[PDB]
Write a protein that binds this ligand. Structure first.
Ligand SMILES: [Ca+2]
Ligand SMILES: [Ca+2]
Ligand SMILES: [Cl-]
Ligand SMILES: [Cl-]
Ligand SMILES: [Cl-]
Ligand SMILES: [Cl-]
Lengths: 260, 260, 260, 260
């Protein structure tokens, strides 16, 4: 249990982000959701955290692709909570294309949100944790923060940056009661991944599941998706006392991806 | 959280092997403890696991150093417990000496108990788990499973084998509900380490706790030992449903050892 | 040798840059130097590359902190060399400070040159090399692209990001005859580092060379500095055919830095 | 380049091991080959190297599965060579089978040879190198020393042990002018390999080249085998004054295998 704890998750209005915000809350921590999305959904989910888990759940808007905006975003966050014990850096965007064909504009946005946002966020959370004697910076990289895949230059670089950045955060606060780790996800049955599945399904005349296993075969040996409840659990674990000595390292939930 | 689960931990009569069993027993699993010791203390440690967590605890002596003996051993445990859900391959010894001064005896022993016992124990338990459709193989490796240190050729080579072996186990059972991961601890305050702290405390004319920091300084930036309770905790988490898609990788509780 | 190859090198008017150019040139390839400097020395350096090794040497200026600048740069490089086989991204800058006190000017300035210049520079050379059928992109990363250190969030983030980009580049051009590898150096006795030999020298009362070892002890087990020439050799190595199938990997010359 | 050097390669009467003894010879170093085969075949090769490179070649028959035997083998190698500057541990064996079926004979035979031999061979060559003030230990592992594949437990374990063993050896001798790295090749068109490629060839009716790209496509992106000569060029480069500061690291030649 993380009762009494004050958690903050960026880009947490749906999918991965919203999943961890859910499990942290379910674990007893007060949270702060963030990210763009159809407003009613935002409020509806923010409300559903409060009621279903009996904790405080605030919503603070912020376009993390902006250095300063994100730095103040956490300050407000901490004020809304009356503290800041756990910070989950999730915000992210993607784009597929060969290097020679990769839009410089695209390259900057991914680096800015995927990499930069993590730095500015930590930079602002640390002082509050250092002064408390306890903290947890959990960055959400991916298996791509450990290995690469065709045409994902920007994303892989950024993710590899986050892993490194995770290691300096850990060393700079070693022994101060603060740890920093990165959860490196594998495939997740995400809405648009769900569209990729349908595409291969009706394009080959196969059931949805067979189509699913088809998309997972090149990378996830388990051929089974990593579930949001599992990602949430990983985060809740890192935040556990048992993870007091775990720091600067990665936690891979990729159903076997990197093992080979 | 692991109520009704049957777990077997090798080298569980004290130290880390004892805490992990205790932690799983606290999670509800029945546990089979194994290791050397004065029968009065074994019966004591076994007796409390039982009276304290209301689970069933059985002790099975076995020479993990012999391929055959370790196989009938798991076969015996499966039987005692009435099944086998979680196997923690813990046992192991250490010998420090330069490469060109390393006793072939010590070399062969380190490898037989630290590496081979893992394989024989994995192979004997795997069928039970494969027929059930669910399993948890947890190898207790080390930071030295990922990196080296002067004068530990046998231990480092053995520990790396475990990490390699753990990857093959996970890929061979991908999607079968059987996962294999390797926990990689850093400095752990063992009884032999206490004397080492004691000796350095008097040598440098400084206090005991100041000597602990001094000892961990070169390898563990957190200047804090990973507790046994913490590794049992990591074991529990690995045995959880939140880790169904965490297979063939490493859990590093090393205070930052491998971040630098 | 590499007779007739057309290698380009960023940040090469001095330091490792010039070194690699010298080795690539020493092996008979036509080079192109690029970097800040006094028109005398630079020319004196180019001109000498032309006489000293019997090859063609060109100089090109460019603000690699600018996409278009760096993209227009390798273009000029080619036009001058009449092709382009070996590309080397070396440029980079440093800045030490705890994450929470790291100026955003420095983080952005480091990410843009150390990491973003790699992207763009690569994206402009690939087409050239793609139509040719042979490529060789060498990215000078750092021990800090695999592990971290205190107060180096940006430089470590950027160098990890280059490792990833290296893999993606290699994977994206698999079997095409183009390979991309990242050389990861340990400490190089740079006049900058020399200022650290001396402070440590005057502070502890030890002779200059004993202080050289005291500086390296913390990270480089061989207590010996990596030399600019050695790196140059490694560059020529990756440019040879023996390395035809080494792609997307790291070549560490760190005296055991990453080994422990 | 290696004129006057004394190098030894185990298991080099043919294949990969031979390519290296050959390239080292071409480098100018005298060499000691070893392995299996007919007296007429061995002599034929020992013959050529010597008479086709202006180098002295000696052949020693030693069973490297026996601890005391391999320790005698290098003793005799330095005797016949007049010193020992380069030791290339290459002798290995394989066996494919699921873990619960993997033959204990097989496991012990793989470990003794693929791993234990590398230990003993290194322990006996070091003293000679320690006294010399210069030395080169080049272990030949594989991508299975970094990652894994299904059904190759003993091999992937032993290989991982080597890599770990390679690190210790380097840290134990860093600065002494001696280095130890591990060459990690990917698919090589080896005898044992070739039949897998002809197996699937007539198992789908496709000519080799296609049934082979099958075997490749799963792990090796560049769809091109690693040639023995290339591996030789690598050992030659690891023996150069360029890699004097390259030690305890792995050098991967695997068409992008570990890149993704
Ligand atoms: Ca991999
Ligand atoms: Ca390390
Ligand atoms: Cl890919
Ligand atoms: Cl050490
Ligand atoms: Cl550090
Ligand atoms: Cl496989």
């Amino acid at each position: 249990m993380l009762k009494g704890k004050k958690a903050v998750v960026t880009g947490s209005t749906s999918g991965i982000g919203l999943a961890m915000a859910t499990e942290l809350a379910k674990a007893g921590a007060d949270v702060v959701i963030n990210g763009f999305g159809q407003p009613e959904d935002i409020e509806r989910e923010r409300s559903t955290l409060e009621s279903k888990f009996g904790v405080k759940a605030y919503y603070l808007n912020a376009d993390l692709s902006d250095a300063q905006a994100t730095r103040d975003f956490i300050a407000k966050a901490a004020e809304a909570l009356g503290g800041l014990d756990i910070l989950v850096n999730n915000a992210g965007i993607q784009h597929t294309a060969p290097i020679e064909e990769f839009p410089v504009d695209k390259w900057n946005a991914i680096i800015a949100l995927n990499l930069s946002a993590v730095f500015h966020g930590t930079a602002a959370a640390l002082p509050i944790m250092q002064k408390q004697g306890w903290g947890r910076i959990i960055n959400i990289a991916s298996a791509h923060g450990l290995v690469a895949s065709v045409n994902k230059s920007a994303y892989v670089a950024a993710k590899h940056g986050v892993v490194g950045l995770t290691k300096v955060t850990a060393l700079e606060n070693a022994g101060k009661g603060i740890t920093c780790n990165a959860i490196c996800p594998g495939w997740v049955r995400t809405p648009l991944v769900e569209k990729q599945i349908e595409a291969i399904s009706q394009q080959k005349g196969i059931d949805i599941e067979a189509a699913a296993r088809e998309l997972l075969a090149e990378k996830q040996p388990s051929l089974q998706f990593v579930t949001p409840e599992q990602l949430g659990g990983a985060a809740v674990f890192l935040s556990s006392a048992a993870a007091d000595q775990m720091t600067g390292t990665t936690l891979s939930l990729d159903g076997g991806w990197t093992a080979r």
